Swiss-Prot record:
<comment type="similarity">
    <text>Belongs to the peptidase S41A family.</text>
</comment>
<dbReference type="GO" id="GO:0004252">
    <property type="term" value="F:serine-type endopeptidase activity"/>
</dbReference>
<feature type="domain" description="PDZ">
    <location>
        <begin position="72"/>
        <end position="157"/>
    </location>
</feature>
<keyword id="KW-0720">Serine protease</keyword>
<keyword id="KW-0150">Chloroplast</keyword>
<keyword id="KW-0793">Thylakoid</keyword>
<dbReference type="GO" id="GO:0009543">
    <property type="term" value="C:chloroplast thylakoid lumen"/>
</dbReference>
<feature type="active site" description="Charge relay system">
    <location>
        <position position="295"/>
    </location>
</feature>
<comment type="subunit">
    <text>Monomer.</text>
</comment>
<keyword id="KW-0934">Plastid</keyword>
<feature type="active site" description="Charge relay system">
    <location>
        <position position="320"/>
    </location>
</feature>
<keyword id="KW-0645">Protease</keyword>
<protein>
    <recommendedName>
        <fullName>C-terminal processing peptidase, chloroplastic</fullName>
        <ecNumber>3.4.21.102</ecNumber>
    </recommendedName>
</protein>
<keyword id="KW-0378">Hydrolase</keyword>
<comment type="function">
    <text>Protease involved in the C-terminal processing of the chloroplastic D1 protein of photosystem II. This proteolytic processing is necessary to allow the light-driven assembly of the tetranuclear manganese cluster, which is responsible for photosynthetic water oxidation.</text>
</comment>
<keyword id="KW-0809">Transit peptide</keyword>
<dbReference type="GO" id="GO:0006508">
    <property type="term" value="P:proteolysis"/>
</dbReference>
């Protein structure tokens, strides 16, 4: 057994042990391993890399890929530079014919500005058809020199005809995780049953990152302090990002019971529950969501709904429920692998299904800016949130 063969095996093993589906997409994982060891050239590192890649492909899971030591490192050093993008976070389609689609059009970003919406299929990036490419490959296409341009062609799902050809200028897009306000003189159409007052606390979590937690905490604390009659938690177009932030937020609102299950073809492998340490467990709550509501955000929504902590209003969410992790190799290289799936507290997959609203509403109706928000809520055509 050579060093190179030993390395290929670390990769094969990473999947053998961690993969989400222990039937390996109806393939004999073990048979593959032996076959490859006998048939695939692996005398030089570069070739062992090709072998791993070839191996990973049989699973037919676009999220599962191999990463070379440099790319891994660079992923890691990540976010920094004059490297800029177009305000687009991506993922693959919720039922894979293939497709790379928009996950999140960053608020006030180029893509956003141009009309790109969550869920839109990306056909090409500067002439190259992106279908089936690694998300890493795609990110690279969209990324580039500061203030430079790139052509993105997209179409609405199921309408390859209805395409739009975006000419985008690459620029850093700073984003804020949390904003909130108190809306006063709120219309009644918008108040929870029996509101002592016409005031709603509004909390906008546009993103789940490392800053979300502290800002959300503070927000709920103040609002509770003010005794608003109801809370509006807006997670529309929030790609999810940081899972832990999603859980911390949910613990702020739900004081007991289960929040989210981590499952695979084995059964439940892990679970996250309330820790009892909430900020507000009593003010009536409504959560705004939409098709751009994904991953950690959907976990939050699911927890709020299933526990009966709040109603869900808007339109069904993204349905992005897979969990990928990177397994590092001795190499310094790594295998990004899908290892689990989020399920709601009720035992339902987030993947494909998403979170469904209790109050079906046009998710467009409400603005995202504080002023505009209070304006629509305190008005004649204020949405019937509750």
């Amino acid at each position: 057994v050579t060093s190179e063969q030993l390395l290929f095996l670390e990769a094969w093993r990473a999947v053998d042990r961690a993969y989400v589906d222990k039937s390996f997409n109806g393939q004999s994982w073990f048979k593959l391993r032996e076959t490859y060891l006998k048939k695939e050239p692996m005398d030089r590192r570069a070739q062992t890399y090709d072998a791993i890649r070839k191996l990973l492909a049989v699973l037919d899971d676009p999220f599962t890929r191999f990463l070379e030591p440099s790319r891994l490192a660079a992923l890691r050093r990540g976010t920094a530079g004059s490297v800029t993008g177009v305000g687009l976070e991506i993922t693959y389609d919720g039922g894979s014919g293939k497709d790379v689609v928009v996950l999140t059009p960053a608020p006030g970003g180029p893509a956003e500005k141009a009309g790109a919406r969550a869920g839109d299929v990306i056909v090409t990036v500067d002439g190259t058809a992106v279908k089936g490419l690694s998300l890493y490959d795609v990110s690279d296409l969209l990324q580039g020199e500061a203030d430079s341009q790139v052509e993105v062609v997209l179409h609405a799902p199921g309408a390859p005809s209805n395409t739009r050809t975006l000419q985008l200028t690459r620029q850093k897009v700073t984003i804020n995780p949390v904003t909130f306000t108190t809306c006063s003189n709120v219309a009644a159409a918008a108040l929870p049953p029996g509101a002592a007052k016409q005031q709603l606390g509004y909390v906008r979590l546009a993103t789940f990152n490392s800053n979300t937690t502290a800002a959300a905490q503070q927000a709920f604390t103040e609002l509770s302090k003010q005794g608003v009659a109801g809370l509006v938690l807006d997670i529309r177009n929030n790609g999810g990002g940081l899972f832990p932030a999603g859980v911390n937020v949910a613990r702020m609102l739900v004081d007991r019971g289960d929040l989210v299950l981590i499952a695979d073809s084995q059964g439940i492998r892990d679970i996250y529950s309330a820790d009892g340490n909430s900020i507000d467990s009593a003010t009536p709550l409504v959560v705004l969501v939409n098709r751009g509501t994904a991953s950690a955000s959907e976990v939050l929504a699911g927890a709020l709904k299933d526990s009966k902590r709040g109603l869900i209003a808007g339109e069904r969410t993204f349905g992005k429920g897979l969990i990928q992790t990177v397994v590092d190799l001795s190499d310094g290289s790594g295998v990004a692998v899908t290892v689990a799936r989020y399920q709601t507290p009720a035992g339902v997959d987030i993947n494909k299904i998403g979170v469904s609203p209790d109050v079906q509403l046009d998710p467009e109706v409400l603005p995202t800016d504080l002023e505009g928000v209070c304006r629509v809520l305190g008005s004649d055509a204020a949405p019937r949130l509750f």
